[PDB]
Symmetry: D3
Amino acid sequence: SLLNVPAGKDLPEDIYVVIEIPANADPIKYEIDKESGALFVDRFMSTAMFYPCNYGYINHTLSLDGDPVDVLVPTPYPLQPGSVIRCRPVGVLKMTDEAGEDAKLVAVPHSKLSKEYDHIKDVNDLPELLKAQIAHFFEHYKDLEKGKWVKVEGWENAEAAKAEIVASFERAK
Amino acid sequence: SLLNVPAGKDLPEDIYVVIEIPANADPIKYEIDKESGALFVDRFMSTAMFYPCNYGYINHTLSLDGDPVDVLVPTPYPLQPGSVIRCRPVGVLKMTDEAGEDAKLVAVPHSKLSKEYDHIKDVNDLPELLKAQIAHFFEHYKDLEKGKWVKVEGWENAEAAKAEIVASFERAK
Amino acid sequence: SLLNVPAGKDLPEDIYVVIEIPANADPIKYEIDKESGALFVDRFMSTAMFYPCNYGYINHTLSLDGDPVDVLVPTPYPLQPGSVIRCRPVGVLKMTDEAGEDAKLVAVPHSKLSKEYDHIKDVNDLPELLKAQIAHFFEHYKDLEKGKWVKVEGWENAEAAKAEIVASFERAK
Amino acid sequence: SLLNVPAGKDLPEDIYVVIEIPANADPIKYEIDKESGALFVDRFMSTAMFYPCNYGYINHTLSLDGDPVDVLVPTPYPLQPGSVIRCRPVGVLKMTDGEDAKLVAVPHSKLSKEYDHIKDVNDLPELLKAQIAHFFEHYKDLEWVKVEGWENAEAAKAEIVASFERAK
Amino acid sequence: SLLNVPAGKDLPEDIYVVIEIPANADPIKYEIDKESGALFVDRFMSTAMFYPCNYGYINHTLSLDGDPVDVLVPTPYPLQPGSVIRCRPVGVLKMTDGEDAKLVAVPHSKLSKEYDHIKDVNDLPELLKAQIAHFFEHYKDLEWVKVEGWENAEAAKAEIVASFERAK
Amino acid sequence: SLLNVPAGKDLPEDIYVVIEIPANADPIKYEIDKESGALFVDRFMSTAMFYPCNYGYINHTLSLDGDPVDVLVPTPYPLQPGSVIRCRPVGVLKMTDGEDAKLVAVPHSKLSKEYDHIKDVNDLPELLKAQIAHFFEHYKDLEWVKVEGWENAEAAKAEIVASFERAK
């Protein structure tokens, strides 16, 4: 089951991300139940927006918010909700919402799966448009939800990202 | 696995439905094997029709036909086969086929996932067109299958639906 | 889980095939991890080609290459990656790659699921165009991958196919 | 522009069919406006059904009901509404609702060889023929038709010719 | 050909809307070239958003900004870019970026009954009305607009009439 | 109407490309009929391959093979068959089957900035350039071509100019 998926081959350089929401999909926010490993519908997004990247999490990680580390993974084509992709950390989007601090990692597919992201070694190597869309997205997707708000603080490098993976992995024990 | 999915949070008001066939999909009738929890192809429908709603079942229920209670769930967008959605009972379509009596529940997404179905508290609140299409569908999808026939008897309220859920849940023990 | 799926109802006549790649899909090569039963992204194909059939494997089989027997399954509509379909053996495509000998079976949906393939009792009954596309595909999909090469040797009948299923099934014990 | 398309290269064997509705598509019934040649939305179908084949007409034809000869064209993939496809007549589904007829035509061999074996109505897959009948029999239920039967390639050609001359 | 489409059967109650952008589609902003009538790619949207409704214009109309009256049309399924749909005005979303207005129209009852109950702007689903405002408010962020509010069916008709006469 | 589209705003730097085949679509080869301007089905491809880019031509051009200059245009999302997109030439893939050439053009900066960095053929992603070569090299296998190589933006412009003047 997805529950048995490893955090990665060689953390924090080599990780697996369990996909929950494909890029460019209909406004359905899926989430993998951590008890059954099944794909649950979290909710139908209220805004007319779509995820700019595939969104998921790293298994066997535990962050301060109590949940696993979530990651955005750009790929040539949208992935199946519930699939596992091997990728590597390149940065982190830092923000704050009605609950407190939030941080989402950005990771690109591993060289074994494609050589299109080999030159992307850090947050500053990602296409600027993409970065702008990701920020804009998180900053506005919950707008039609009363009580929820998001403020994008900024981006951090691969080091900070790998830092979060290792911290959260050790903490998950 | 899907096999471990609960019948619901608070039966019969709050239930989870395991989706097998998305709305508006290609003529493939999927079914979750109750032994493996895997999605099996039951058959390729012979008629040029499509399910008007997402179709699935409530786990941990056992009706008189020997199988779990099946439900039709309307949503804004088609759901992934094998996903679990939290919804609530609003009515039941009663019919008879070559095997005997058959009844399929209609349930709408729970308020947590969307507020579009809050005003739909009973079978009589559902759009008439939708009800007509659901009946028409079940009454004709097996037409090109020799030996199978369906006759729609009628609709019943939320009470009758919740009655079926509770009966079948207790019976599943 | 998919890991618990049987090789078939009555080998080698009646088998189940676990689907990994749907026909006519985007260039993503999926693969079911044999440890978790989860769907992993193997890689993004480099060529501008798509699988002519649904591609998967028979569970509980072990061939000489160390992996389960893989099968190509034509259907009216593309199947969900990770679904299980009941079909029957009609032939085998024989070829050789940079690793050595390779053979892929062709199987058509079982009569229970559809009556469109009943007249297809052997490799020679398959549409010639289809056979040409399958061969062409395997012969060129890895062209943009340095080190990999494929040479199609030829087709064999239902007998040879059933032979491979039985050998690999017994060997998997 | 779509209005300027000919009935075909060589009636009634070789014809051009203007596609209005694609096979396996959403229940939106489009129709080319004979005045502008633009694609109009005729109506949203009310039954949960889809056309088992692409659906269109042969331009420059006039059947007794005042409309051009309409045809169903099976293809390996759905065509674009408003595209034109070269085919050859293979049969006609007769029915009554007055009297109505829908021809079946397959892609001309210049576009594909997948249909060379289908010379007549009987050559068409039984299931396909059965899905077409059922569809036309039931798609207007929530709004009626009775399927009379199938007629041959010659009958199909006869309908094309009559309607074409009749259009002149 | 698309240029030859009329403003409608009976302005301002019964109108034809030429669809340029489908609902829920990829972020590609198309626009019909008023000179050729062909479908041009205006630009690729930079925000991760999609039109909650089909978007187009009423031919033969001229608003103050030199363009025809643009309309948003909700349908059960996305329409084809370049298709024409018969509708009836139900409201207008006002905003400023000069001043801008976007009418909302629903499918004419001849195409569907699903909207007969929507006689006015208030009849439209609150969420739908809220997604339209937010979209127009935020889709050009990465390239600005301020939503003033919603006006009624009468206001909508008034805009159609003025722009139509103004086009003459 | 599609016949009335110009070759571009400013040849050979700024050109309009009429798209006939979308990127990543079903193996249906469409082509705009130069007589009606309607979208015709040329044939159903027999190989399991798809165009890695949108494919079309520059209207009002006449290459030596009697056809207009054909172009491949990479976009973030597949375009609609029959739409027109403003681009700028960046290269040309040469081959022999007589001699054949296919220009590559990217979206004009007015539509997107995602391609401003691609000034020449070498600027195009190696993989993309490699998928285009392989595709044209193998798509007609089940029905032949040999890829000669890639030429620059200047070579591309030269082809546009010659064919345009030649069309006059």
